[PDB]
Amino acid sequence: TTYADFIASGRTGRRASIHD
Amino acid sequence: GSEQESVKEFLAKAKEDFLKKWETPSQNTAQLDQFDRIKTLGTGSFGRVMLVKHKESGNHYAMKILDKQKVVKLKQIEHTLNEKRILQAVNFPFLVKLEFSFKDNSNLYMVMEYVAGGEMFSHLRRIGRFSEPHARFYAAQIVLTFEYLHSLDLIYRDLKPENLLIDQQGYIQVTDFGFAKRVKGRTWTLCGTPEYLAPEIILSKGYNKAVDWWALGVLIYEMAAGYPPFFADEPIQIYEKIVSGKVRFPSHFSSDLKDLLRNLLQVDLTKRFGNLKNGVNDIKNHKWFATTDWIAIYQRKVEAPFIPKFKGPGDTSNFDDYEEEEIRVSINEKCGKEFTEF
Ligand SMILES: Nc1ncnc2c1ncn2[C@@H]1O[C@H](COP(=O)(O)OP(=O)(O)O)[C@@H](O)[C@H]1O
């Protein structure tokens, strides 16, 4: 499932804000 | 209509207050020593936020701390000045209230009210996903928030569950105004969180307030699906899906919700909800929102689907644990010139 692909991805934790 | 009109008036009167503050900003309302530093509540860009305790009144607050030098090396001076200046002038139910702001040799400090229920983010990950009705109660407060901000010519540009806290009554409080900016007209800085970036942005075409509405689009999906619409492991893969102009919705999404979404997640600004003739109105009147009593939302009259558990004053239970770090103040002033008006 897409959900399962989400959970195994490297971006399930808090995401930081980018700049330049 | 009568209902609008009332909004228009309220909004007009709100613009009047904000200008007053926008034009004559508060400075040095306290000092470090007037607070007992308790525990780091989270981190962010080049700052940290801590639970603090006001020695004089007994209140607890969240104090955000920025290292001047860091802000300077990371070219964020204007953003920092903007953050504080905007935060001190605003006033709306779903915005965190800035109490005091002050500086010292090495840092910038912003003291805001403590929102104890934790980040929406954490409840969200733990629960998996929210029900359409739960998601709607949240979306609604964001719609009214952006209506407010935008009316003041402000672009907020970092919507994400990590930046929406849940208060004691189950309502939201937006935090992190670090990229907020007051502009009439277009903007071009490259900033935000990858998963939430509008295409024009990634495409660096120059943009406006419509990027916020795309963001609300992402937020809503995330909430309801339990995962963002364009996810990957490396930012770049993420940027390619966002521009490609292709979303796939889960099988459980109501038709009303996907309808709203396909409008919000619209690649063509010309076609994106919120950036057209009826403005925000196209959103407030959408079918998905047929059940929302916007005024009662505003007045905090609706029952919150979920009320976090707060056990005592200063209770940090609803937040993760972070490595505490020492706060160092030089016996030497760092970049005074740059931060003069702070
Ligand atoms: N008023 C507040 N009450 C409680 N926690 C807060 C408050 N404001 C921010 N935080 C916490 O601090 C985290 C990071 O702070 P943020 O405002 O995003 O600044 P920065 O990104 O510079 O650290 C937020 O995700 C949240 O966990």
Ligand SMILES: CCCCCCCC
């Ligand atoms: C954008 C804020 C809505 C104003 C509602 C005021 C209730 C009379």
